[PDB]
Symmetry: D2
Subunit: 380 residues, 4 copies
C-alpha cells in the first residue's frame, strides 16, 4: 500500500472492542488498577494513553520509524530532543533554523554548557571546517524558511555518522508524505504538527520519530520526565487532520508549483524561491531526497513599496506569522519571523523588505492567480 492508503488503513481504522472508526478521546488523568501488584496497560495519562499512543504509532509508520512521540508543540519536541545532549556537547546547526530553535540553542542550552556554531548546511565544506572534538549533533531544517534552500540530508548524515554525531531533521515543511529523513540517515525527525500535518490551524502540536530503540528509550524518558505531552483532545484533532494530509498536500503542492511558474514570469516580480523551479539552487538535491517541492514559496517584488501595495490589494490569503493551513497564508518575514535580527543578519540570509512567503491552501489556483494578477496591477 502507498502512504496515502496508510493514512487510513492502519491499526486504528477500527476499535477492537466497539468497531469505532475514530480513536476515542481518553479525557482521563487517572486509571483504576484492578490488581495490587501488576498495573494494567495505563497507570497515568502523562505516561501514556490510547489516544496519544495511536498518534505516536501512526507518525512512526508514516516516517518509517520504530517509535513516535507527541508533544505540546513543535518547539517542545525540538527542545525535548536537545535534552539528549549534556554540558560540554557541541551542536552544528543551520543558520536559517526556525526562530524558536535559534532562541532555545542561544538563550537556554547555552546556560547549560551546550555550545553551537551556526553554518550553511548547504555547504558541506563550511560544515566540515567547524567540526569540533565534542560535536555530538548536526541540526538540519530542509527546505529552509523563507528562501527554501535545500540541505543534502544523506551527505550531512554521512559526515555526522563519521564522527559518531547525531543528525536531527526538522521535516515540518514537506511532511512524511514528501520527505523521509530517517531513510536518508537522520537519527531524529521533528515536526510542528501545528502546520501541515494537522493542517487546519486549530491545534498546537509537536512530533518526533526515531528508528533506534536506545534513542527511543532516551527520548521516551525525556518526554515523560519534562512532561511536555500532547493532551488527548489535541491528539484527536491531529489524528483527524492526518486523514486529509495526502489530498491537502497533493493539491497545495501542485498549486504552489503552478503559482511559482506564474510568478517567475511576471515582470513586476524580481525573484521566486521554490525548490520545484529548475533554476532554484538545490533543485537537484530536492528531487534526489523528496517526491515534491511542497506547498511553500517566497517571492520578491521590486521594492518594499510594491510589496505594501500588493498586500493592500490581495483579497484571498490570510496575513499571519504561520503556514501549512487550508487557507492560503501570506507572511512578511522581514516584519514577522526575522524582525528581531539585525539588518546585517537579514541581508546575509537574503531576507529583504521586498520578500513575501506564500503557504498555498485549498483555494482554486485560478482564483489565487487572478487575485495576485489584480493586486500586481496596482503596482509599478
Amino acid at each position: 500500500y502507498s502512504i496515502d492508503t496508510l493514512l487510513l488503513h492502519n491499526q486504528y481504522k477500527h476499535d477492537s472492542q466497539t468497531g469505532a472508526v475514530n480513536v476515542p478521546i481518553y479525557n482521563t488523568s487517572t486509571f483504576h488498577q484492578f490488581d495490587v501488584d501488576t498495573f494494567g496497560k495505563y497507570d497515568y495519562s502523562r505516561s501514556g494513553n490510547p489516544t496519544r499512543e495511536a498518534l505516536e504509532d501512526i507518525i512512526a509508520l508514516l516516517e518509517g520509524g520504530t517509535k513516535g512521540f507527541a508533544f505540546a508543540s513543535g518547539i517542545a519536541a525540538i527542545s525535548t530532543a536537545f535534552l539528549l545532549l549534556s554540558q560540554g556537547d557541541h551542536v552544528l546547526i543551520s543558520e536559517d533554523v526556525y526562530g524558536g530553535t535559534y532562541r532555545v540553542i542561544t538563550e537556554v542550552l547555552s546556560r547549560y554548557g551546550v555550545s553551537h556554531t551556526f553554518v550553511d548546511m548547504t555547504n558541506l565544506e563550511e560544515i566540515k571546517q567547524n567540526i569540533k572534538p565534542n560535536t555530538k549533533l548536526f541540526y538540519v531544517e530542509t527546505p529552509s524558511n523563507p528562501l527554501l534552500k535545500v540541505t543534502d540530508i544523506r551527505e550531512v548524515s554521512k559526515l555526522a555518522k563519521s564522527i559518531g554525531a547525531l543528525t536531527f531533521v526538522d521535516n515540518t515543511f514537506l511532511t512524511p508524505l514528501f520527505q523521509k529523513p530517517l531513510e536518508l540517515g537522520a537519527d531524529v525527525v521533528l515536526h510542528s504538527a501545528t502546520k501541515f500535518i494537522a493542517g487546519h490551524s486549530d491545534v498546537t502540536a509537536g512530533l518526533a520519530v526515531v528508528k533506534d530503540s536506545e534513542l527511543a528509550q532516551k527520548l521516551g524518558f525525556l518526554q515523560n520526565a519534562f512532561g511536555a505531552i500532547l493532551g488527548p483532545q489535541d491528539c484527536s484533532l491531529v489524528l483527524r487532520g492526518l486523514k486529509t494530509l495526502h489530498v491537502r498536500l497533493e493539491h497545495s503542492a501542485k498549486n504552489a508549483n503552478k503559482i511559482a511558474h506564474y510568478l517567475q514570469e511576471h515582470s513586476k516580480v524580481k525573484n521566486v524561491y521554490y525548490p520545484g523551479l529548475q533554476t532554484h539552487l538545490g533543485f537537484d538535491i530536492q528531487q534526489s531526497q523528496a517526491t515534491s517541492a511542497g506547498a511553500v514559496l517566497s517571492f520578491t517584488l521590486q521594492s518594499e513599496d510594491a510589496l505594501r501595495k500588493f498586500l493592500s490589494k490581495v483579497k484571498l490569503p490570510v496575513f499571519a506569522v504561520s503556514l501549512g493551513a487550508v487557507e492560503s497564508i501570506l507572511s512578511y518575514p522581514a516584519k514577522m519571523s526575522h524582525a528581531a535580527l539585525s539588518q546585517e543578519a537579514r541581508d546575509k540570509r537574503g531576507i529583504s523588505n521586498s520578500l513575501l512567503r506564500l503557504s498555498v491552501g485549498l483555494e482554486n489556483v485560478n482564483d489565487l492567480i487572478s487575485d495576485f494578477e489584480n493586486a500586481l496591477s496596482y503596482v509599478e
Copy 2:
C-alpha cells in the same frame, strides 16, 4: 470578597463582546494580522490566546500573584521553573519531593551542571548545614507525600532570602484555597492542576504563579521558549474545574478530618498521618501557614497482610497512582509512588508495606466510614 466568591466573580464572569459566562475555546494556532506593522493582541497560540490567558490570570488572582503560567502538565511547570537556574547552580530540595521532581533534578539537570542535596526541609538546622556558596534555590513541597510532613514555608523562605536564593513551593496538595506560599515568602508557586484544581481526573495540566515582574518575564520567556504550554481545550476543562474548587475541597477536607479521627481510634490501625491531628508533628506549623489540613491522609494497618485484606474488601475508593479526584482514591505508595526506591530509602521515609494513602472524594462520609468498618472487619 472571600476567595470562594473570586472563583466566580472575576474579569472572565461575562465576555464583553457577547455576555458569554464561559471563556470561548480558541482552537486556533494562527491569528490574521489586520495591519502590516502592528500585530494585534495575538500572533500565535503558543505565545498566548484568550482561553489560556483567563486561566493564567485566575490562578495569579487565587495565589495573590502578578502573573500565572499554564503548562502541559505539573511536571512541565516544575521543569520549566528549574530552567531559571544555569550550570554551576546548586539546589536544596525536599528528600520527599514528588518522584517526577526527583527524576528531573537527578537524571536531567545533573547532566547540565545543576547540583543538588536532598534534605529534611522540616529540620531548619540540616537545611542550614548543607548550604553552599552556589546554592540558588530551596525547593519545598508541603505537606509531603505520603506522610504529610509539614515544612515551615516562612522560615525556609527567610533562610533562602538571607543568601539571595530562590524559594519554589509545590502547593498541589492544599491548593490556593488553603495555603498561599507567595504570601509566606516563596518566589514561585507550582501546581499539578491535574489534581484538586481541575478535580475531575479528566485533564493533565500545570500552573506556576510569581509576584515579581522580573521572574515573571524570565518564566514567561521559558514557557514560550521550551513550549510546554497547556492547549486551549485543556485550559477550558481546568477553568471549569476551578469553579467547584471551594465546594469540592471544603467537603473533602472536612470528611478527611472526620475519617482521620475515626481511623486514629480503630484498634486495627497502627498510625494515621494527617496534619489536622493535634498529635501530628507539624500540626502547629500547618495551622500557622494554612487554613485547612486538606483532603489527603495516610494510615498504617498491622501488616502488609491486613493491608491486602483491606484492599480486597473495600468497595468505594478507586485504586490508582493519583489523588485530588471527586472519586475517593486509595494508593499503595510502597508499590506505586515509591516502588523504584531501595527498601532502605523507603524505611528512612517511613514508607512501610502496611501504609495506604486516601485522597477523599465527594462520597457520603458515612458510606466511606462504613465501607472501611466493613473491610477492617475481615482483618486481624
Copy 3:
C-alpha cells in the same frame, strides 16, 4: 449507599478494558461490523454509543427508573415525550409551564389535533373539572417558575392513573437529588440538564427517565426516529457536571434558604417566594415529596423603580435568562421568561414588574447577603 455516593460509585467509575475513571468520548458516527450477519453492540452513533449510554444509565439510576434518554436540549426531551400522544389526545397542563413547553403545546401540537387546557395544577378541583374523555396526559412542573408554587405529584398522578392518563413531571428545578417524581407516581420525568445537572452553563442538554419497559420502548423509538440526540462530547460535559451535583446543590440550597429568610425580614422587600418558608403555600406539600426547597427563590421590591435601582447596584450575580449555574443569576421574569404575555396573563400569574428571581450559585453566602444589603441601601 446514599445518592451522593451513587454520583461517583456506579458502573462507569472505572472502564473495564483500561481502568479509565472517565467515560471515553466516542466522537464516531460509524462503527465497523466484524461480522456480515450479527452487527456488534453499536452500528451508528445516533442509535447508541458508549458515552451517551453511560449518561442515560446514570440518570435512570439517580431518578430510580429503568431507562434514561439523552437529548440535544431539555425542550427536545419534552417535545419528544409529547410525540407519545396522537391526534385526538387532550393534555391537562400547568398554566405556569416553561415558555418553551407552552409554545410547543400551543403552536405545534395544536396543528396535529393534540388539544390542551392550562390549569392551576395546585388546585385538585379545577384539574378534576377540566378532565375530558380523551384526556391522555397530565403535565406537571413543580416547583413553578417564578413563584415556586408546589404541585402535589402523588395526588395529580392518582387522578391521572384513575382515567389511564399519563403523568409527566419537569423536575429541572429540584433535580433527582431532592425530588424523585417516578416514586411519586409520574410515568415520565423530564430535565433541562442545561441547568443544575450539568451546572456550569457550558452545555445544552435534556434527559428523560421512565420506569415502564413499554414506555421505554416507545420513547427510545421516538429518540432515534426524530433524532434530537445529545452528542457524545456534550454527554461528557453532563457526566462531568453530575459528579459535583450533590456538593453544588447542597451548598446553593442551604444558601438559598438563608437568603430567603434574610430577604423576608428586610423592610424594603414586599414578598419572598421560596418553598422553604413556613408561610409559603405548598410548604407542607414540598416537605412531603422533596428533601429540599432547592436553590431558586423570587422576591418583590416596593416598585419597578426600586427593582431597577437594586439591579444597577448589585455586583455579584450575573443578569441572564437562565438558572442552575455555579454563578448566582438574577432574572427579571416580566422582561425575560414572561415578556411575551399580556399584562393580564402576568397579573394572573403574580408576575409583577417589582419581581426578581435569584438562582443561588457557589459564592460565599455572606458576600451575597452584603452585596444585596449594599444595593438595597440605595433604594426607598
Copy 4:
C-alpha cells in the same frame, strides 16, 4: 470566486476582535445581559450562538440560500422540516427514501393526520397520477440509495409549484459542491452533515437551507421550538470538515468514476449502479442538474455466495452502515439499510442479496482496484 474558494474565503476566515482563523467554540448556555431592557445579540445558546451561526451562514452560502439551520442529526433536520405540515396535509415521497425518513412519515406523522403516498419520483406520470387536493409536499432524494436512481429536480419542482406544494430535496449524497437543489426549484434542501460534509465519521449533524424569508421564519421557529439543535463543539467539527469538502469529494468522486468503469468491465460483476456510466438511466438528468456523479456506487456479484467470498477477502474498506467517510465503506444494503423490508419490497427496489454499496474514501485508487482484483480472484 468558485465554491472551492468560498469554503475558505467567507465572513468567518478571520475573527474581527482577535484575528482567530477558526470560529471560537462558545461552550456557553447562558449570556449575561449588560442592559435591563435590550438583550444583546445572544440570550441563550439553543436560540443562537456564534459557532452555530457561522455553520448556518456557510451552508446557506454553499447552497445559494438566504438562511441555514443546524440540527443534532440529519434525521432531526428532516423531522423538523416536516413540522412545516399540519394534520390533513398529504405528502408525495420517494419510495427509495432513507429508512429514517420512511419511519418518520409512516410511524410518527401518520399519528398526526399527515398522510403520504410512496412513488417512483423518476416517473413524472406516476407522480402526476397520485396527486391529491391536500398534497402540500413533494419529497425528493437524488441520487437514491443504493441504486443511485436520479430524480429530475426541475420537473418535480415545476409540478409541485403548479399546485402550490412544497419541494424538499435530501442532497446528502452529492453535497452543495455538485448539486444545488434551491437553484433547481426546491424550497428546502436537507443534509446529513454526518456524511460527506463533516466527512470524518466523528460527528452527527443535520443542515437545512431555504431561499424564502417566510419559510426561513417558520423553520427557524421550529428549530428553536422543538430544540433539536447542533451543539457548538459539534458545529466546530462540521466547520472544520467543510474546509476539505472540495479536495475530499473531487478525489473520491474521480476515484468512484474510475472504480465504476473498472467494475463494469470485470467478468465476475453482473451490474454496476453509478450515475457517471453512460448506460445508467438518469445519466442525462444527472449531467443536467449536477456537476458530478459523486463518490457512491453499488455493484452486484453473481450470487450471495460470491458477495460473501468478496467480503471475506477485501482488506481496504471498512464494513459499516454509513457512507461519506475518508475511509472507504462497503455496505450490504439487503442486511443493513433494507434488512427490515419484506423480500418483495427489496425485489421491487432491485435490492438483491448479491448487491454491495461502496462509498469511496481517500485511499489510493490503485490500492482500492488491486484489493478488489485480489478479492474477486477467490470468487467463481
